[PDB]
């Protein structure tokens, strides 16, 4: 997967999307839909779907929602206040946590100002808490801005890694785009019938 401070961003495009294989897979620990309840996804069409991917702790999945606060939603990944898509999350302890600590999953814990929605910040400048200038060296009130989850397999739930995917359906002003499958029956012949081709 991808870090939490530099999430990925895949732009799903013109296709046949089947959110039912998602919705009923029962492997997801969290499947919330906000703009639109889940069962009506395979009956609508939009312009673009974006999919963002990252990895967080277990009890940080409640900050991936419109209108929250905390070190994740403040400055790592912010969701607008009129979100439309759905948020999916599942536990991944066996893949991402390794004995001795997996120190490759970082997050940002200091920033000047909270993110704009869907804004991204991969810089690595030395934070400056106090008034004293920092000059690119560490010290009191001059902190490196990235911390690392040290994931370990013997962690209580809520400290084990969860993988998160945020689908965001957007509708600019194009002519059309991806929609759900078009279930079709069988064609009969030699009988007065009511048809749709």
């Amino acid at each position, epitope marked *: 997967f991808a870090s939490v401070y530099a999430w990925n961003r895949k732009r799903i495009s013109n296709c046949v999307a089947d959110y039912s294989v998602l919705y009923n897979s029962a492997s997801f620990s969290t499947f919330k839909c906000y703009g639109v309840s889940p069962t009506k996804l395979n009956d609508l069409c939009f312009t673009n779907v974006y999919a963002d991917s990252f990895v967080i702790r277990g009890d940080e999945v409640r900050q991936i929602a419109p209108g929250q606060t905390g070190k994740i939603a*403040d400055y790592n990944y912010k969701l607008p206040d009129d979100f439309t898509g759905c948020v999916i999350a599942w536990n991944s302890n066996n893949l991402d946590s390794k004995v001795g600590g997996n120190y490759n999953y970082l997050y940002r814990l200091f920033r000047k100002s*909270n993110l704009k929605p869907f804004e991204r910040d991969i810089s690595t400048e030395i934070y400056q808490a106090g008034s004293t200038p920092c000059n690119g060296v560490e010290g009191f009130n001059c902190y490196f801005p990235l911390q690392s989850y040290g994931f370990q397999p013997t962690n209580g739930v809520g400290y084990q890694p969860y993988r998160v995917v945020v689908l965001s359906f957007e509708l600019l002003h194009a002519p059309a785009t991806v929609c759900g499958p078009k279930k079709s029956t069988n064609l009969v012949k030699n009988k007065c019938v009511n048809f749709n081709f």
Partner: antibody
Amino acid sequence: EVQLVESGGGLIQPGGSLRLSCAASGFTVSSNYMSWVRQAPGKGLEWVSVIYSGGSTYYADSVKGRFTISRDNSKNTLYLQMNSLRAEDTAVYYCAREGPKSITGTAFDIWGQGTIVTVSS
Amino acid sequence: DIQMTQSPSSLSASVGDRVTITCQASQDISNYFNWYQQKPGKAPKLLIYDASNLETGVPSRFSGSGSGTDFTFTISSLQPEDIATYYCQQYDNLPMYTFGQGTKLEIKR
């Protein structure tokens, strides 16, 4: 070279609106994680509140709805806007900076010697 | 939630000895655990953090260990310059910081 003095305390009746002024030196309080921690006489410590350096606020759920934190980023003062007591909040109130001291993990590393708040009229 | 209980409350320390206070918890954590020292009257100071890694200013004494449920704080003895109160802190992603009760120490003059 980094001690914060809090102005406040004094007695008061149940239902007051006293607020405390934690004024810091040596670092910006608009870029750190300042927090409040109280402890009752002859009891263990207890967390009260924290503010993140973007504006967010959190409360200890026993004192939520009655407490407020704010800061002055041009005066370096940290405010605990307290009101509507219940006369069990008689304690000594400490300020603390929450700063990382590892590749993973954070801690309270500088404190403010405490100020007494009493209530009973 | 997670509540940590410190078993031996205000033992007796003799000069030239050892002492091991002991604390455990709920559902396990890992290295998110700091030990504090509050003298009788002053503000608390931090002297452990994470689990070990002494603090810059603490002497060659005061070692700590344990990493999944049980954590043991150990002193090479009981310097008369102690008799303080020792707390334990944990924390979580969500705002929270549950301080465990704590002990005392003492001496045998």
